[PDB]
Design a binder for this molecule. Structure first.
Ligand SMILES: *[C@@H]1O[C@H](CO)[C@@H](O)[C@H](O)[C@H]1NC(C)=O
Ligand SMILES: *[C@@H]1O[C@H](CO)[C@@H](O)[C@H](O)[C@H]1NC(C)=O
Ligand SMILES: *[C@@H]1O[C@H](CO)[C@@H](O)[C@H](O)[C@H]1NC(C)=O
Ligand SMILES: *[C@@H]1O[C@H](CO)[C@@H](O)[C@H](O)[C@H]1NC(C)=O
Ligand SMILES: *[C@@H]1O[C@H](CO)[C@@H](O)[C@H](O)[C@H]1NC(C)=O
Length: 159
């Protein structure tokens, strides 16, 4: 379940009956390291998902040429994105500051959706103060799912 006491979670409405469930968790959903966006249609569903999060959360992601370890999978049109977060220490957070995952951590922290996030490091970048968040959560999961089902993980791939 996304809505478990050992998790932290939030739902974003994006469509008419669609949205994104965001879950900080220690349960891995995707146990492969790849994210196959060879399909231009899948590339488009991936970009739209990340775009909805950035715009809904008014994120400004600093450009540190950094990257969050990540995999994805599709169940029909439903996307699953998993980040394997490198945010355990203040220095890990700093080295993973310019990522969408960090901006999501920033948002969970800002709105008290988790007690397990710290603003661990700040640094000037292009005239703005970037904040880099540490968390003990190992994974951040993004799934396209409905409000009615947002508390239950969807199956990452079909059968
Ligand atoms: C998740 O795992 C990390 C790393 O082992 C641990 O420090 C943390 O307490 C765990 N969080 C929960 C909610 O179990
Ligand atoms: C979190 O709690 C749920 C429900 O008790 C359990 O199924 C799950 O295994 C727990 N998470 C981890 C990482 O053990
Ligand atoms: C994330 O961690 C899981 C479990 O440790 C692993 O199976 C998976 O390959 C990892 N994914 C990435 C993108 O590193
Ligand atoms: C979520 O899935 C529905 C179909 O299940 C799809 O129409 C919609 O575009 C998806 N949302 C995205 C990709 O943001
Ligand atoms: C995808 O998600 C939609 C709602 O988000 C759901 O109705 C559907 O059963 C899911 N799976 C597939 C294969 O479309």
């Amino acid at each position: 379940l996304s809505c478990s006491k050992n998790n932290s979670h939030h739902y974003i409405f994006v469509g008419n009956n669609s949205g994104l469930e965001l879950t900080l968790t220690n349960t891995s959903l995707l146990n492969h390291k790849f994210c196959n966006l060879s399909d231009a249609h899948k590339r488009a569903q991936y970009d739209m998902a990340l775009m909805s999060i950035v715009s809904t959360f008014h994120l400004s992601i600093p450009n540190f040429n950094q990257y969050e370890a990540m995999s994805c999978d599709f169940n029909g049109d439903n996307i699953t994105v998993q980040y394997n977060l490198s945010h355990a220490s203040a220095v890990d957070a700093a080295n993973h500051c310019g990522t969408v995952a960090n901006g999501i951590l920033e948002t969970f922290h800002k709105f008290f959706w988790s007690n397990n996030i710290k603003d661990a490091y700040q640094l000037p970048n292009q005239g703005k103060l970037a904040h880099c968040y540490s968390t003990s959560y190992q994974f951040l999961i993004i799934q396209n799912t409905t409000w009615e089902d947002h508390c239950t993980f969807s199956r990452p791939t079909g059968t």
